[PDB]
Amino acid sequence: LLDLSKFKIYYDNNHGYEWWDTAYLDEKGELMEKYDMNGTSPAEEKLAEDIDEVDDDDDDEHPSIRYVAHPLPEKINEAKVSIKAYLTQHERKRLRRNRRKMAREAREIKIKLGLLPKPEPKVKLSNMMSVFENDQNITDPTAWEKVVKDQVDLRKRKHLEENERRHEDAIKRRKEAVNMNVEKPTVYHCKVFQFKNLQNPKIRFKLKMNSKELSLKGLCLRIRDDGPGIIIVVGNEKSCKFYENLVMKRIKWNEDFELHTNTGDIKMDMHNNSISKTWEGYLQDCKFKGWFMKVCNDQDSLLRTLGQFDSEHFYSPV
Amino acid sequence: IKLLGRSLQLDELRDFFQQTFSSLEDFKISGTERLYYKYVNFLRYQDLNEEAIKFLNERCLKSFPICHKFFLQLGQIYHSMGNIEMSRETYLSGTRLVPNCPLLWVSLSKIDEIDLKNPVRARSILDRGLLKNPDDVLFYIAKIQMEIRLGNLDQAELLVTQALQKFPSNALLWVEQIKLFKHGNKSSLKKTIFQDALRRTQNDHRVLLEIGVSFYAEAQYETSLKWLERALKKCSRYGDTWVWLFRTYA
Amino acid sequence: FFTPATSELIFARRFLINYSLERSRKRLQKEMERHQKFNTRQELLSRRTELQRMANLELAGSQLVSTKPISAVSLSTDDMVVATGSWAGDLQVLNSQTLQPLTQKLDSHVGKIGAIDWHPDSNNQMISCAEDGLIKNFQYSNEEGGLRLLGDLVGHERRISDVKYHPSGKFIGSASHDMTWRLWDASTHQELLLQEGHDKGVFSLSFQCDGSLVCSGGMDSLSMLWDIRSGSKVMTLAGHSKPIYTVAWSPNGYQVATGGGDGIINVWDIRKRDEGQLNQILAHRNIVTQVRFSKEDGGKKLVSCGYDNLINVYSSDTWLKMGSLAGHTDKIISLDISNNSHFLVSGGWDRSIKLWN
Amino acid sequence: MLFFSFFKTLVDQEVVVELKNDIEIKGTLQSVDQFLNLKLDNISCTDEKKYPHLGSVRNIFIRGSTVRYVYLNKNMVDTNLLQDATRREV
Amino acid sequence: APNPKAFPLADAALTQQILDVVQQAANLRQLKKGANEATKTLNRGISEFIIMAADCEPIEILLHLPLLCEDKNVPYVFVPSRVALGRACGVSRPVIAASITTNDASAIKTQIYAVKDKIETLLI
Amino acid sequence: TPLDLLKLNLDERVYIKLRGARTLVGTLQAFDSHCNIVLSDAVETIYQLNNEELSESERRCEMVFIRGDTVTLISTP
Amino acid sequence: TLKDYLNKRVVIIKVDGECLIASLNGFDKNTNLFITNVFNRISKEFICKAQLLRGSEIALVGLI
């Protein structure tokens, strides 16, 4: 039976009357006939509602031939991106000068109509020898040195501490911030690629992790593991670009690699394998809920999978 | 071979070549080997008799080398003895076999434009060549040259600009641009352009030479001489510069 | 909603309906006949052959034209000469197969040429638009010289994108960066329509070859199929995301095909009342500039050029990249196909016209 | 056949497997069969006390009945496809 | 409302992007502001892409630049706001024309290229 | 029929009880003829009586496969 | 499958508790292991020269 099946398949191969490598052409007649019947007019859906009717010199009544329409022009909801107004160098300087000045003034007041802190003398190892406000400066030489060096360290340490604090707070913000930002995406750039092979782990890993990083809605489908396959990547433009770069410049799909298994570590020489960008467009809506890498046993299956997002077309048989 | 040529001893040269040939049979998978020698042999043959080459080309080039230079040589030979269509065919074949060689494409273009008077075909060919390999600036340069050769100068300029955008450093493009400028459409934005070229090409040997030539054309001769000297300093091994210098001196 | 009227339109509208209807009926009959006499094998084979031919087209002749780039390339009805508008405001014409000029006409338009169309009555009185902001009919003579203009037609305010001739020959539709698309009276050179149906300009038109339906492709991505007779629409904007820079029908009224800025050519309007796309096609990496078909005269074959430096061809049943056409060096802004044969003439930013054979 | 298929689809996967008798082992899944057995390559440590008394055992064969879970992450497993499959079946 | 002849006008996001690019170029000295400077750039060939102001009144004083670009095959937009453009450039005074110039070794080459591509897309 | 009935609460939160006093809460993403379950966004709660006093042990796992031998009850919380 | 495990020493752990080092010489579809040269893992106690281990008992098997 198996042999028979094989034979049949072979027969089909040589000359297919319709085959799904390239989606079938042939137009069915029965359907057309049915459509015609439905129409009942010898014309089409568009014209059918003039329905064999004639008034005066051919005219109609159900849809009027007198009036000119001026229908409602649907205004698209444009996303108000409040503009990054920039500053001149001079402007920036002025801003810096004034805020800082104000701060200084405050400090002065909050230390002269205030005495809320005190201002000490900023020693260093070059001052050291010349400061006398703090005592012991020759009296206790090494004590003095310790004090001054210590002070310096504190200053430096304080600076470093401040930096650390900043780092911490930024980190704290960022996690929260990402979570907060569930902004409504207006338009999605997409790029769909296809590759002859990817029996390498590394490439697959790259595809995964990068996608995860970049909120990259999409997938990577393929046939029979070793066989050819497609990537569809979608998101913000920059991310897409990055992905493309990774695909084309960073990765070498013509590299020789190793497969690690229980039986033995298999060398895979693939000079034949290559990669091409098919599409690089803008999709009206991104129906890809995440990045759903897959494999399929067959082409039909792959097609079906693709059409789970109501979009087969991304694939290109060659 | 060179020595022989200098001396001029035809039969002797032939004998030498024959001797070399016998030895040659051991040299399988040798670097810059027969491919070089065979070209030289062809040239020698051409220096006297044309047809006799062709058989060798048919035989030897086909087997081991499969190299563009041979095709070019063949084309040249054909040109020398008329047979234009045949030459064109040969060129086409070469292109089909080796897409990645601008020279062949250029030759084809020339044949299209100069020999028969249909530039459009030549242009098309050039375009095709360019498409086949956008790695090389050479194709672009060739195209520019072709454009220059015919009346159309704006187009040429545009092409040059495009080339620059794609590969800014390539001295030949700069040279072409300079040449275009020298035509005297602007006769201005000239010095600035030259400066720009110099900057981009890090005072490229050839750019300097081109500048000198332009100045020569304009007939400001001391300046031209200076430019030529500069070019020489940058790299004396290059030729046309010397010629230009000589001309200036004259 | 907001419905006044005019008398000229009324006079014409009835005629349009009659003409459209009869022709439509004929087309339907033809279609019926086709299904009745076709077979799985031979037709399929023929199609395959055609596809192969399309694929193995290569760039025959690239003839330069103009200072600025070549907005429009339009092959005559006769299919003998091609007309090539450049951005300068000049519309040279070339004997297609050799591709050598007849004349130049800079003093025609001052602005950027839009589209050129040829008149479908073989009597060659081509129309052309511009950003200039006026269309011009040109009685073309092979012998006399080149072109003589017949009439100018000031209707739009802003710059025009595209004119077409309604397959009758009695009307010329023109769409512009103004909000409207406007159908003209071929004889008297006076307007009738003005569909204020888009929030931004109508960037492209396309009549259906039966003569019933005109798709106005807008800069909004609102492709509106207007029954001209009715002033009533059977639309989907749900095709495109960026602007619809072109639209064109499979001559078999069966299909509309809108080419986009998004690049995705959307081919829709079908017997299917649900109006779903048999497919969307991924046309060009950058944007799509022109979309064409060619079943007048031969078989139906989608062909499009883009701002990607590639023309390409699609099977009108499958919708697939049947073959890329490397040939241009730079952007390709327009294109036409030889009615009878395999012989594309396309132009653009390379500032040349180019043939494919 | 759904579940088997799913298992197969997870070929070459570092996954933790908790058994009935307090044995938690990590490993790279290789072979999958009708009764849902797991052969794991490169056995690594998960916990200190629960992980059994092994060391040089780099390849194992887990009996399908004795597994409690097969501890996947949220980036290592199918879901609504499985649901669809279930729906299709009776 | 913006001028019809100022074409192609950008869109909002696109405009923003372009201004960002301009700013970057300004910091890196890879930009030139001003109609005349834009013209100069065009003449040279150094112009990667030209940015004009739609809200230039009287618009005419730009509307050679587009022509020049067309004849040199440099992409170009108008943005809407000349004030904004000026600010981007780094000039309090309101500016109409700027040119992001060419330089292979820019950090911002890639970014610039993106913007150029976008501009080209607009043109038709 | 019972299997069919469980097709309603797919892709929503569920409450699953196993043998050995192991409460599993997540969202139902899979089942079949033998009732093998795959939970996403899950969290395990292990009741374990030791030293004559009650003590729960929480194992947090963002996904988990469950074999049908262990399963007792499926419901919603 | 236990076809790679035949003619090789293997570490086999049961459901109840014990762990056995021995040479696997036969398997079937029900996981009944035919074993030779039997030994215990922890105790190092020689049970016998040959035995059969029922598939219900096998919790884990390991190649070594």
Task: Quote the CA–CA distance of F41 and F18 in Å, as a whole number.
Answer: 18
Going from the C-alpha of D76 to that of each of A293, D44, D45, E2, the distances in angstroms are: 11, 18, 19, 53
Task: Quote the CA–CA distance of G26 and A78 in Å, as a whole number.
Answer: 73
F chain contacts of residue D65, beta-carbon cutoff 8 Å: 67, 69
Helix (H) or strand (E) holding A17: none
Contact B158 E44 (CB under 8 A): no
- Cβ neighbours of residue A76 closer than 8 Å, sequence gap 6 or more: C199, C220
D chain contacts of residue G5, beta-carbon cutoff 8 Å: 61
Q: Are C20 and C212 in contact (CB under 8 A)?
A: yes
At C228, list the tokens. Answer: 């001209």
Contact A262 D9 (CB under 8 A): no
Placement of tokens 């990607």 in the chain: C308
- Of the candidates A219, A209, A214, A206, the one whose C-alpha atom is nearest the C-alpha of residue A290 is A219
Please count the residues of chain F: 77
* C-alpha C332: how far from chain center: 15
Q: Are C332 and C347 in contact (CB under 8 A)?
A: yes
Single-letter residue type at B92: L
Residue A317 burial class via C-beta count within 10 angstroms: exposed 0-12, middle 13-18, buried 19 and up: middle
D chain contacts of residue F70, beta-carbon cutoff 8 Å: 68
Per-residue exposure over A267-291, b if at least 16 CB sit within 10 Å of its own CB, e if not: eeebeebebeebbbbbbbebebeeb
Q: What is the torsional sign of CA B225, B231, B235, B238?
A: negative
Q: Are B37 and B25 in contact (CB under 8 A)?
A: no
Contact C69 E120 (CB under 8 A): no
Q: Which chains touch F (3 or more CB pairs under 8 A)?
A: D
Contact A72 C1 (CB under 8 A): yes
Total domains, chain F: 1
Task: Quote the CA–CA distance of E94 and E55 in Å, as a whole number.
Answer: 10
* C-alpha A287: how far from chain center: 14
Task: Quote the CA–CA distance of A252 and C141 in Å, as a whole number.
Answer: 59
Going from the C-alpha of E115 to that of each of C16, E11, E62, the distances in angstroms are: 47, 13, 21
To the nearest whole angstrom, how far is the Cα of C301 from the nearest Cα of chain A?
12
Task: Quote the CA–CA distance of G64 and D53 in Å, as a whole number.
Answer: 13
Q: Which of A79, A88, A237 faces E90 most closely, judged by CB atoms? A: A88
- Cβ neighbours of residue B100 closer than 8 Å, sequence gap 6 or more: B132, B133, B136
Single-letter residue type at F50: N
Centre a 10 Å sphere on the Cβ of residue C163 and count the other Cβ atoms it contains. Answer: 27
At C352, list the tokens. Answer: 């040349």
Total domains, chain G: 1
C chain contacts of residue A35, beta-carbon cutoff 8 Å: 271
Centre a 10 Å sphere on the Cβ of residue E58 and count the other Cβ atoms it contains. Answer: 8
Contact D83 F67 (CB under 8 A): no
Helix (H) or strand (E) holding C340: none
C chain contacts of residue B121, beta-carbon cutoff 8 Å: 60-61
Q: What is the 8-class DSSP label of residue F68?
A: T
Residue B49 burial class via C-beta count within 10 angstroms: exposed 0-12, middle 13-18, buried 19 and up: exposed
Return the CATH number at G4.
2.30.30.100
Collapsing DSSP to helix, strand or coil, A94 comes out as helix
- Percent of chain B that is helix, strand, coil (3-state, to 5): 75, 0, 25
At A2, list the tokens. Answer: 């198996």
Helix (H) or strand (E) holding B168: none
Q: What is the 8-class DSSP label of residue D12?
A: S
Q: Are E97 and E53 in contact (CB under 8 A)?
A: yes
B chain contacts of residue E120, beta-carbon cutoff 8 Å: none
Contact D30 A262 (CB under 8 A): yes
The helices-and-strands tally (H runs, E runs) of chain A is 8, 7
Is the bond into A56 cis (omega within 30 degrees of 0)? no
- Of the candidates C183, C190, C258, C264, the one whose C-alpha atom is nearest the C-alpha of residue C223 is C258
Centre a 10 Å sphere on the Cβ of residue C236 and count the other Cβ atoms it contains. Answer: 20
- Of the candidates C39, C41, C52, the one whose C-alpha atom is nearest the C-alpha of residue C342 is C52
Q: Count Cα atoms within 13 angstroms, Cβ side, for G6.
A: 11
Centre a 10 Å sphere on the Cβ of residue A8 and count the other Cβ atoms it contains. Answer: 10
Counting CB pairs under 8 A, whether chains F and D reach 3 or more, is yes
Contact D75 A262 (CB under 8 A): no
* C-alpha D58: how far from chain center: 16
Task: Quote the CA–CA distance of A177 and A188 in Å, as a whole number.
Answer: 22
C chain contacts of residue B162, beta-carbon cutoff 8 Å: 329-330
E chain contacts of residue C286, beta-carbon cutoff 8 Å: 117, 120-121
At B40, list the tokens. Answer: 């030289």
Backbone angles phi, psi at A70, to 5 degrees: -140, 70
If you measure CA to CA, which chain A residue comes closest to C275? A45
E chain contacts of residue C263, beta-carbon cutoff 8 Å: none
Counting CB pairs under 8 A, whether chains G and C reach 3 or more, is no
- Of the candidates G29, G24, G14, the one whose C-alpha atom is nearest the C-alpha of residue G52 is G24
Q: Are D3 and D16 in contact (CB under 8 A)?
A: no
At C298, list the tokens. Answer: 């031969």
- Cβ neighbours of residue F13 closer than 8 Å, sequence gap 6 or more: F25, F26, F27, F76, F77
Contact C320 A317 (CB under 8 A): yes
Per-residue exposure over B178-197, b if at least 16 CB sit within 10 Å of its own CB, e if not: bbbbbeeeeeeebeebbebb
What is the DSSP code string of C229-256? Answer: TTTEE--B-SS-SS---EEEEETTTTEE
Q: Are B179 and B201 in contact (CB under 8 A)?
A: no
Collapsing DSSP to helix, strand or coil, A239 comes out as helix
Task: Quote the CA–CA distance of C207 and C23 in Å, as a whole number.
Answer: 14
What is the DSSP code string of B16-75? Answer: HHHHHHHHHTT--S-TT-HHHHHHHHHHHHHHH-SHHHHHHIIIIIHHTT--HHHHHHHH
- Of the candidates C55, C60, C31, C40, the one whose C-alpha atom is nearest the C-alpha of residue C314 is C55
Please count the residues of chain A: 318
Contact C307 E70 (CB under 8 A): no
- Of the candidates E103, E107, E118, the one whose C-alpha atom is nearest the C-alpha of residue E16 is E118
> Domain limits at D3?
1-90
- Percent of chain E that is helix, strand, coil (3-state, to 5): 50, 15, 35
Going from the C-alpha of G22 to that of each of A136, A263, G30, G62, the distances in angstroms are: 83, 22, 19, 11
Q: Which of A23, A36, A71 faces C318 most closely, judged by CB atoms? A: A23
Per-residue exposure over B137-165, b if at least 16 CB sit within 10 Å of its own CB, e if not: bbbbbbbbbbbbeeebebbbbbbbbbbbb
Task: Quote the CA–CA distance of A210 and D73 in Å, as a whole number.
Answer: 18
B169 touches chain E (CB under 8 A): yes
User: Which residues of D have a CB under 8 Å from any CB of G?
Assistant: 19-21, 23, 25, 31, 33, 37, 39, 43, 52-54, 56-63, 66
Per-residue exposure over G30-55, b if at least 16 CB sit within 10 Å of its own CB, e if not: ebebebeebeebeeeeeeeeeeebee
Is the bond into E8 cis (omega within 30 degrees of 0)? yes
Q: Which chains touch D (3 or more CB pairs under 8 A)?
A: A, F, G
- Resolved by: cryo-EM
- Of the candidates C231, C127, C245, the one whose C-alpha atom is nearest the C-alpha of residue C177 is C245
Q: Which CATH number fits domain E1-124: 3.40.50.920, 3.30.1330.30, 3.30.1280.10, 1.10.3470.10?
A: 3.30.1330.30
Q: Are B118 and B112 in contact (CB under 8 A)?
A: yes
Q: Are C168 and C19 in contact (CB under 8 A)?
A: yes
Single-letter residue type at C309: N
Task: Quote the CA–CA distance of E13 and E6 in Å, as a whole number.
Answer: 18
Return the CATH number at F44.
2.30.30.100
Task: Quote the CA–CA distance of A195 and A273 in Å, as a whole number.
Answer: 7
Chosen for mutation from A262, A268, A287 (greatest number of chain D CBs closer than 10 Å) is: A262
Collapsing DSSP to helix, strand or coil, C216 comes out as strand
With a CB-CB cutoff of 8 Å, which residues 134-163 of chain B face chain C? 143, 152, 154-155, 158-159, 162
> Domain limits at G45?
1-64
Centre a 10 Å sphere on the Cβ of residue B81 and count the other Cβ atoms it contains. Answer: 12
Q: Which chains touch C (3 or more CB pairs under 8 A)?
A: A, B, E
User: Which residues of D have a CB under 8 Å from any CB of F?
Assistant: 2-3, 6, 36, 64-65, 67-74, 76-80, 82-83, 85-87, 89-90
3-state secondary structure labels for all residues of F31-57: CCCCCCEEEEEEEEEEECCECCECCEE
- Of the candidates A133, A137, A159, the one whose C-alpha atom is nearest the C-alpha of residue A147 is A137
Collapsing DSSP to helix, strand or coil, C37 comes out as helix
Contact A83 E16 (CB under 8 A): yes
Task: Quote the CA–CA distance of D67 and D3 in Å, as a whole number.
Answer: 15
- Of the candidates D65, D30, D26, D58, the one whose C-alpha atom is nearest the C-alpha of residue D42 is D58
Please count the residues of chain D: 90
D chain contacts of residue F50, beta-carbon cutoff 8 Å: none
Residue B55 burial class via C-beta count within 10 angstroms: exposed 0-12, middle 13-18, buried 19 and up: exposed
Q: Where are the beta strands (DSSP E) in G5-57?
A: 8-14, 19-26, 33-40, 50-53
- What residue ranges do the domains of chain C occupy? 62-357
Q: Which chains touch B (3 or more CB pairs under 8 A)?
A: C, E
Task: Quote the CA–CA distance of C191 and C174 in Å, as a whole number.
Answer: 10
Q: Are F31 and F65 in contact (CB under 8 A)?
A: no
D14 touches chain A (CB under 8 A): no
What is the DSSP code string of A136-187? Answer: -TTTSHHHHHHHHHHHHHHHHHHHHHHHHHHHHHHHHHHHHHHHH-------
At B185, list the tokens. Answer: 């459409």
At C333, list the tokens. Answer: 């802004």
Task: Quote the CA–CA distance of A158 and C90 in Å, as a whole number.
Answer: 73
Edge to edge, the sheet with strand C288-292 lists C288-292, C301-306, C310-315, C321-326
Counting CB pairs under 8 A, whether chains E and G reach 3 or more, is no
E chain contacts of residue B165, beta-carbon cutoff 8 Å: 102
At A127, list the tokens. Answer: 């001052």
Centre a 10 Å sphere on the Cβ of residue D56 and count the other Cβ atoms it contains. Answer: 9
Q: Are B123 and C352 in contact (CB under 8 A)?
A: yes
Single-letter residue type at D16: V
E121 touches chain C (CB under 8 A): yes
- What residue ranges do the domains of chain E occupy? 1-124
Cα dihedral angle (B178, B184, B189, B191), rounded to 10 degrees? 60
